[PDB]
Amino acid sequence: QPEPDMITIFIGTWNMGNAPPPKKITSWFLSKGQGKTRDDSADYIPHDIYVIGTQEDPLSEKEWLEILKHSLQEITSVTFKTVAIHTLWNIRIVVLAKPEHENRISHICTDNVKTGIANTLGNKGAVGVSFMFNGTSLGFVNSHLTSGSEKKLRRNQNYMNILRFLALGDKKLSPFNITHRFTHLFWFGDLNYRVDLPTWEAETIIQKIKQQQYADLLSHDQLLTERREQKVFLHFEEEEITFAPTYRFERLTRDKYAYTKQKATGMKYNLPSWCDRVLWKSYPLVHVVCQSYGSTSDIMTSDHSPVFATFEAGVTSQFVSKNGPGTVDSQGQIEFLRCYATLKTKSQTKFYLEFHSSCLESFVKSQEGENEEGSEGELVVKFGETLPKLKPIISDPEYLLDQHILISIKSSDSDESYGEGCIALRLEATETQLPIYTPLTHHGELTGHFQGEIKLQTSQ
Ligand SMILES: CCCC(=O)Nc1cccnc1Cl
């Protein structure tokens, strides 16, 4: 029974509006409705993993698990196994997997982050799950961010708090936040970013939606504009949106957007918006392809419509050789030539690097770099040919070329990371000097760059 090199993952996000779901929600899991939808010929083919995020979820965990599992069993005739379930207030994540995957899944972590302070602490935040699927680390975040058209900056702040404080994945990756801990990270939820057009334009927006003309609306979508200005979700991907705004509907139909200010909305307008989103970030040169991204049309208990996204994701096997795990394989090495970090910091400490990778027995600390001044004000930290030779556990190129090296540049004075990034070992050649590059971030914001050359020796 061979190990897979690809799986498919279903991501759902649905703000349930504190109402129980209708009796049938199968269209969600089938990726049917509006947008990039799944072919009918696939309807009986189960996804490998289903990850369901809800917000304003009024159900108990038990109640929702019974609906989800019976939904999937009706579609696929498979009884899915529960990998994890975690709830913060009314924000919930469920991970279900095909039974054949039970002994491929391990290291399951759950966590939550509560956003805001005093006033603004008590219903927004995020839940998440991570696990290993054979050799591949997977992370999933369902966030319910701050509401209201004039709170995009708060949403951006919520995002940074969640990625700083959500404690998922391998705790030994201490310099790295969730945006670096996983082969594949999926972040979804009621992100609550709005279409930023004047209130007076509400009926014009509705007209555009009825004509399926989204271009002039998407050009004002706050998540797309904040991401283009590098204010949020730096280095994440999102499929093109080709479905109608998923908020705010009159319940029990989809024929009406309810946008006008009401006491129940705090006298705020809710112009039609793409509140409900799925984004991802995968390590460089790992296969990930979005195969659906859309909304359902026939689930109408909430003022939001459910959103679905599906992905092909590359996975790797739990590799064993005669040498590693449990020792190094002297026929493998990773060398760095002519490396330097360019940092945005105004500070003047010495810096050193740490290399972290599950291809190493443990992380590797470099010597301190040599600081120089860049021509446009920058700090340049030069490592030259001084970086330690990395000793992978396994030399087989079928393993090593699928690996990644995480890099943190740390202050000698504080041991605090000033920047994190990731280098793929999926090189064009071995035993050949090749350019490498990663942006460096800290708390998910850009702080610099790391570039140089790599020379990878495998057993071939
Ligand atoms: C609800 C948690 C039950 C559980 O232990 N799930 C699990 C763990 C490891 C691998 N696969 C699965 Cl389904």
From Swiss-Prot:
Tyrosine phosphorylated by the members of the SRC family after exposure to a diverse array of extracellular stimuli such as cytokines, growth factors, antibodies, chemokines, integrin ligands and hypertonic and oxidative stress. Phosphorylated upon IgG receptor FCGR2B-binding. It comes from Homo sapiens. It comes from the Eukaryota. Specifically expressed in immune and hematopoietic cells. Expressed in bone marrow and blood cells. Levels vary considerably within this compartment. Present in at least 74% of immature CD34+ cells, whereas within the more mature population of CD33+ cells, it is present in only 10% of cells. Present in the majority of T-cells, while it is present in a minority of B-cells (at protein level). The SH2 domain interacts with tyrosine phosphorylated forms of proteins such as SHC1 or PTPN11/SHP-2. It competes with that of GRB2 for binding to phosphorylated SHC1 to inhibit the Ras pathway. It is also required for tyrosine phosphorylation. The NPXY sequence motif found in many tyrosine-phosphorylated proteins is required for the specific binding of the PID domain. Phosphatidylinositol (PtdIns) phosphatase that specifically hydrolyzes the 5-phosphate of phosphatidylinositol-3,4,5-trisphosphate (PtdIns(3,4,5)P3) to produce PtdIns(3,4)P2, thereby negatively regulating the PI3K (phosphoinositide 3-kinase) pathways. Able also to hydrolyzes the 5-phosphate of phosphatidylinositol-4,5-bisphosphate (PtdIns(4,5)P3) and inositol 1,3,4,5-tetrakisphosphate. Acts as a negative regulator of B-cell antigen receptor signaling. Belongs to the inositol 1,4,5-trisphosphate 5-phosphatase family. This is Phosphatidylinositol 3,4,5-trisphosphate 5-phosphatase 1. It is found in: Cytoplasm; Cell membrane; Membrane raft; Cytoplasm, Cytoskeleton. Interacts with tyrosine phosphorylated form of SHC1. Interacts with tyrosine phosphorylated form of DOK1. Interacts with tyrosine phosphorylated form of DOK3. Interacts with tyrosine phosphorylated form of SLAMF1/CD150. Interacts with PTPN11 in response to IL-3. Interacts with receptor EPOR. Interacts with receptors MS4A2/FCER1B and FCER1G. Interacts with receptors FCGR2B and FCGR3. Interacts with receptor FCGR2A, leading to regulate gene expression during the phagocytic process. Interacts with GRB2. Interacts with PLCG1. Interacts with tyrosine kinases SRC and TEC. Interacts with c-Met/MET.
